[PDB]
Every structure is written in C-alpha cells, then in structure tokens.
Amino acid sequence: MNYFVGNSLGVNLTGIEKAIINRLNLFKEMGRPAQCVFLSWNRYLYRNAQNYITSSDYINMYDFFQEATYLERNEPFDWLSYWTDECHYTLKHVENSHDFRIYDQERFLMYAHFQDPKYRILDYVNHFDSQRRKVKRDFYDVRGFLSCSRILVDKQQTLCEFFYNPEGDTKLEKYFSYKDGKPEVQKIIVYYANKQYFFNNETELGAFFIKQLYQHGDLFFSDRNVYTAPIFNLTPESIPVVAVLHSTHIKNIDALDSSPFKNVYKAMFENLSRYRAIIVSTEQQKLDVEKRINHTIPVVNIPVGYSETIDTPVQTLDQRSVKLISVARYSPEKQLHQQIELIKRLVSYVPKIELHMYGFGSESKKLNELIQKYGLENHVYLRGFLSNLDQEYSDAYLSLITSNMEGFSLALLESLAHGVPVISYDIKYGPNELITSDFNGYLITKNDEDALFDKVKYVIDHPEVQQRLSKGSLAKAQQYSKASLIKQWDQFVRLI
Amino acid sequence: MNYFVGNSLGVNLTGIEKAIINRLNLFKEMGRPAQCVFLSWNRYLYRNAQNYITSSDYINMYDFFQEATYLERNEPFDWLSYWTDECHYTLKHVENSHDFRIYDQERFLMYAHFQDPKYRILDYVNHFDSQRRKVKRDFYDVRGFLSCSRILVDKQQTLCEFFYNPEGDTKLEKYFSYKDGKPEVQKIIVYYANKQYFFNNETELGAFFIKQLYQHGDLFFSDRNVYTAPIFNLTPESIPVVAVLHSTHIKNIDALDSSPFKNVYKAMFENLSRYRAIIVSTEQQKLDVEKRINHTIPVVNIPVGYSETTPVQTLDQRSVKLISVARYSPEKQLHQQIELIKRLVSYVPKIELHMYGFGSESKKLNELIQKYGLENHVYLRGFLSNLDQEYSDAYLSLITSNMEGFSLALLESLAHGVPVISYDIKYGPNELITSDFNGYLITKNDEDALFDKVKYVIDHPEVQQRLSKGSLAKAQQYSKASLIKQWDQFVRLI
C-alpha cells in the first residue's frame, strides 16, 4: 500500500492538494493500491473531499483516532426544533447571520452558529456560565457528530480540547499553555487499542499514527514537508518514505549554491538519509537538487500533472472577441496586477477584449480595486475558483503566467491540453520545460511587462500564429499523457 | 421594393435595430427585394453595419444627398505624416489619447483626434483662430472622407453645419438656433437635382427623401414612429406605408381603454388612415390594439424574432450560471437581479450572473455589485454580438422588466435550450412562456416569488432539464421557415 501524506484538502484545492489527488487517480488506473493521508484536524474534510476522492481513498489522522475514518454524513438533525420543542428553550435569531442565541426562560446559555442558511449544518455552539463568560466551545463535524469540545480560560484562551468519536466517547485530549500569546500544545492523551498514550507534541502524535498505518511492504510519500518531514524523522528507518518537493527548494532560485533551503524544506534536507529518494517535477530541478544535495540520495523528475482525453470543445474561437485567461490562485507570487495593467494599456488596440481570472486567494480585494480603478469592470473578471474549467478553456485565446516562482505549473499544462497557448515569464521551474517560444506560446523575460505586452499584442494581431501555437500546445500536452505518467510512476515504485 | 425605415444603427444594436435586420434577412432568404432605410446623419454607420448587412442593403438619407450612398472605405491615408512631411507642421501628441495638437511654428492651428491608437482612422479636427477660439470642427466619415464641418459661436455653440460629398462639393446645410440650452434646426438647404430645396426641420427633409425613393408599388414600413410617422404624415396617401410597433403602445398597460398612447406613437395614431396596417408581435397586442382603434385599419401580429438551427446545454455540475441578456436601461430593472443574487449566494455559493448588454446604468449597476461584494459572482459582460457560446452553460435566463413587446432575448434563450423566468408582463412573456413547461411567469415585481422559483429550479436539476426541453419545443413554433411564410403572406395581401 502507497500512502500520500499531506495536511488536508481545502474548500478550494491548492496545488499540492491537486497534485496529491492526481497521484491517487493515476495509481487507481495503474492498479496499485493507494490512499491519501491527511494530518490536520478538519471537521469539513468530508465536504471538501467529496467532489474529488472517496472516503475510502483517504485516511485522516484525527478521524482514525476518532473511529470516524470512512464514516458518512448521517441523517440531518433539526437542532432548532430540538431546542424549541424538546428542550423548551427560546431562540433569539441574530440578524444577518445563520446564528442564534439560546435562552432558558431568560437564562443565557449558548450561542449557536450554523454554516448554511437552511440551518442544517451546525458549526459550533458556545457555552456561558452564570456571569456570561464563554467557558466551553462545541465544534461539530460536517457529517453530524460532535467532534471537539474546547475549554477556555481567561480571555477566551484555549486551555484544552477533547476530541470525541461519533458515539461520544473521548478519544483524544490536548493540553495547551500559552507561549508568545498563542496556544502551544504540551500534552496529548490518546485512547487507542484499549490503552492510553502520551505525546508532548503533535509531531509525536503524527509519528505514532504512521506506525499504526504501516505494514511491511508499504511505502510513504511526504508532500507537506513542513509537517510530514519532522513526523518521519521520529519514524524507524525500516519504514520507507520518499520525499516529494512541491516547489522551488531555495529562498532565491537565482543563487543556486549560495542560498538557504526554504523553511518548509529545511527539515528534509537536514535528514536526507531518512528518505529513500526525492521527487521533483522538472528535469532542471532534478539536476539542480542533486548537485546541491551532492547526490547523497537519488532524485527523480515525475511531473505533478498529466494530460487527459479531451471530450469538450477545443479552440471554438468567436472571431469578434478575444478571451485571455489567468488560471492562478490570487496570491502575491502570481503577480496578477501586472495582467490587470497589461489589459489596461491593451483595450485601445483590442476593445471587446476580456480577461477571466480563475482563482480565489487573499489578493481578491486588492485585485478588484484595480479593475474598478482603471474602469475595467466590463473587460476583466474575477471568476471564482472552479474545477472543470474545460468549458472555460473553449473560447480562450491565450493563457498568461506572470508569477516569478512556480515549480511545475498545473494550470500551464492544463492550458496546453485544451489547445490554449501560454505566454509566461521565463522562470523556474516549469515554464522553461513546458513552453518552447514560438512552439506553443512564448517565454517572456522576468517582470519585463513591455516585452509581455508586445508578444500578447503580436499574438492577438496574427491569429495564424495562435492556431499554429494552439496546435503545438496539443503536441506538447501529449508528452505528459496519463499513460506516460502511469508507467513513469510504476517504474519508480518498482525500483523502490 | 420593401423599405424598413428606422433612425440608424448604433455601435451596439438596439431591439428595433435588431428587428429591422431580422426582417431583412427573412426577406433576403425568401427572395423578395428589401433594404433598410436610415435617417439620422451617422458618419460611423458604415462601420456599425459591417457585421450585419451589406452596403448594398441600406440607404442612409445623408449618404443619399451626400452622394455617398453605397460608398466603401478608401485606401488608408497617413494624416500624421502628411501634416509633418507635406505641411511642415509639428505634432504635439496629447497625453493618453489618440490626439495631436497641430502647430505651424508655434502657431496653434488644429486639435486632431483619431479613433484608434494605430492612428489609421481620423475622427474629427478642431480649428482655432488667432485668439485660440474653436471656430470650426471637421467631422470625418469612418470611410475616410470629410462628412461635415460645423461652425461654432460663443461658448462652442453650434451655429450651422455643412455636409459634403466625398469629392468635397457641398450638398446640405443646416442652420441652428438654441432653444432651452440645446441646438435646434431652423433651416435646411439641399443641393439635389442641380437645384436648391428649403425645409424648416429634419422631418420635412425625411418626407422629401421618401418621395425621391418612392417608385410605383414600392412599400414602406415605419419602424421608428417618433421620427418616421411625422415623416410619412407629410407624404401622400398614394405611397403605401405600414406602421410597425415595437413596444407597448400605451403609457400604462393596465388601462387598455383609458390610458394615452406613448409619445412615440401619438403622431401615428392621430393619423391612422395613412397606414395600410399595423404590425405587432404578440397575438395579444394585436387584439388590445384592435379594440382601441375600433378596427379602423388592419392590425396584424408578426413576431420580431425567429429561431434557427453550436454547443447547447453543456451544464457544469458544480456551477450554476444565470444570464440576463438585456440592456442596462431602467425599465429592465436589472438592479433586482443583483438583489436576487445577493440573497441567493448563501444557498448557491458557486452561482454566477452574467449580464449581457450596454446602457445608461452601467454605473448604478456596477456600484451595487461593488456595494454588495458580489464582484466574484455578478459580471457586467457588456454588449456581445454573437452570444451562441455564452448560452451553452447557461442554466436559466432572467427577465425582470415591466414593459416589453416580443422579447428577442427571451426567444433566443428558448432557442438555445435555456429556460426563462420572467415577470408576467405584456407583451411577449405571456405568449412565449408556459409556466412549468419552459420556464416560470412570476407575479410582476414579486421579487420573493422570483427568488422562490429561481432557487427552486436550481434545487432540481431534473426540472431544469425538463424545462430546457420545452424551451426548444416552443422555440420551433417561431421558426424561420414559418416567419417567411407569415411575411410573404402579409406582404402579398397589402
């Protein structure tokens, strides 16, 4: 059995999350057992996983100990008619919210919070004593059951939390003490195997959990090396783990030798004999990493993404309009303001031009402030993150990358697969490998926005080029075919 | 020859403008000659019309007297260099514009303005005197020639206008005086037929033109009645004309008998004996009109739009996409849809509203999308011409106006498989939707009932598909083949 350890799955999948799911779906078709391992406590991971993996494709560490691994949504529960009818409480609704303030004949007891406006998903319930101190907080799983009560001290500070199984029995206790104005774990009690276990640390908890999962002949893959690498350090070398690096390994990629390893990858690079091999996406990163490592341990390049059969429309280009697209999380590294800029000085040459920006991150409001400032309301669109962008690649003329650091770009390959050429700064890793300028898009010089504007403008001018590039896009998309990676993954696993 | 008579075509086609082109394409297929007439001076008309009808398909009255009827673009002319290389002027380019100031050795002469940044289309040239007053503006046709010079007075006020043919010769003159604070024609001179004609307003010119155009057994349709009815009224009964009505005919739809006509239509109704008939779109409007006019003249219903044979109903599971194909004008009540989405976003976090159109409320509507934080959900997509791919992942169409004839936007939805949820307004929705067949009719302005239904259909994808299948069915009742029959019928019998 092959385990791909990560942290968790977001509402919106991140690059690492998407990459993990891809490995899982390749291993599915290949015929090898595989499973995702998630470490982070997350009561919404069932909902978050549902449109991508099945509850048997994944083990979550907390679920495991909560005897709630492979548990489904149970039947919905009318909490409000419980409180009114059964409990003879009265329910003052809080305005502009799915919240409530529960009372028993003018005694304030708890503050209820739901996720949804149908009031079917209870999120949390907060408990108050005689003097309206917030004493205890009950958090609920998205499948129904009460998952964790938390006990508060002083200024709603976390003193400890208790994790339960869906039947209610306690399975986990965590004790907090406040260092630097923030709760740090200091004790963990785990009820497991009809015994009691003690750990000082969530890492020590992580290691224990692995040792349970592990059988002889099982193989691990460490994908959030921030957390997963410390966990594996406290694991016997007898247990094979292969590191998977999900981005550029160093703080400045221009200083190949005189540059520190990233805070996230430091723990792996310190214990490099722990890991059976290390996997990057780009050949360049394979070369770069094994020189800096000094070939102490093998390195392989297996790309995080692959190209699949296209049974939606490709290059159905309305000859009157020009859709440009960004498919990138709205974070600073992606440098999306440069694209709003580009669209600014480009409407006058191509009016009726559109830029659709697919993502959602933190820069949402900063990005929206510019499309508004420059008058670009009817030309630039902040389309929220959505999967199955296949319909959304159909009318796309070009893809833009203006990030500065990317590693393998899943959205880059996804463009090429839909026949949409991409114009991207010439950065590491990824674009260099996936784009050949004047083959399937163009590589632009870093942050050289005038060079950017020129080629984007040139390509909008001569559609004969877009069609030529769009062709070779499909060509390049094929070198990363699902078969190329099933085999490439099968060969890697056998060698190990 | 059948002549459909409107004002002109805009950069974004209006409902009537779309209708005149639809009628043309219909006649063109069925083989009866027809061609659009446009009245107002519009020096971008040939560019506006490039995608919809030929230059053989249309006669603009200014083009006609300007002897530029059926004229096409010239070879490019390099004005920038001509002013430099041949007129030894300097060009002080104006910042953030396609404009130059034109000097002759520190003497400020002209302010040029180009449309495009490629400087290939000269738009207008402003002329200044020795004191730097703007005395003359030179308006250029997008085909390259000088169409009109306007002489200014006082506070850049329009005093008279001269209209040329492409050779340069002068063909019309208009003299203005200011009523309120706007210019108003008071004299028109026309050099046509090697003679001089005098008219007192643009209406009398319009009537003079018609008679120039008219030949025995030509037939005319009046499609912009605020302007065209006054024209045909100054025209002899011997010229056949048929009124065509494009909105509700009455200031208030609720008093069928009592209320006044819309200002647009007063001129028409007050002289109903001049028109061989009225065309309307919906069977209902045919009746309501007939009652009021006491069957004085024939009323006939011939829908403004037809359906025809591109991906359809390729619905992504995770996202719900709502569409409004409607102008950003106030009587479409498009703010109500932003309010809808605002309520509906916490039940449907993946929802979108794409709002296709142009219009005066682009700013009111933009502010609300900003105020409510719906910038990631409601989009002002602005006017798009071919919408065939936007309809593909459309879940439903939305209508929230209060006044409509046939909705061409509604039928287009139904044609592309997209059910419509509309208020129960006259005319059009009553006729094209059958609730729980291809969409729902809502009590007018019942924004709760609207929300209730929109959320419902979203809740039941299986209903949506049932509704989509009925929308395709109803659309084939308004087919192309059938409307060519309706036109050929109701031309032959007039």
Author numbering:
A (entry chain A): 1 to 496
B (entry chain B): 1 to 309, 312 to 496
The authors write:
Two glycosyltransferases (GTases), SdgB and SdgA, are responsible for the glycosylation of S. aureus SDR proteins such as ClfA and ClfB. SdgB first appends N-acetyl­glucosamine (GlcNAc) moieties onto serine residues (O-glycosylation) within the SDR domain using uridine diphos­phate N-acetylglucosamine (UDP-GlcNAc) as a donor substrate. The subsequent addition of GlcNAc to the glycoproteins is catalyzed by the second enzyme, SdgA, yielding glycosylated SDR proteins in which each SD repeat is decorated with GlcNAc disaccharide moieties. The glycosylation of SDR proteins mediated by SdgA and SdgB protects SDR proteins from degradation by host proteases, thereby circumventing innate immune attack.
Despite the biological significance of these two glycosyltransferases involved in pathogenicity and avoidance of the host innate immune response, their structures and the molecular basis of their activity have not been investigated. This study reports the crystal structures of SdgB and SdgA from S. aureus as well as multiple structures of SdgB in complex with its substrates (for example UDP, N-acetylglucosamine or SDR peptides), products (glycosylated SDR peptides) or phosphate ions. Altogether, the extensive snapshots of SdgB complexes in multiple states provided a mechanistic insight into how SdgB recognizes and glycosylates the clustered serine residues in the SDR proteins.
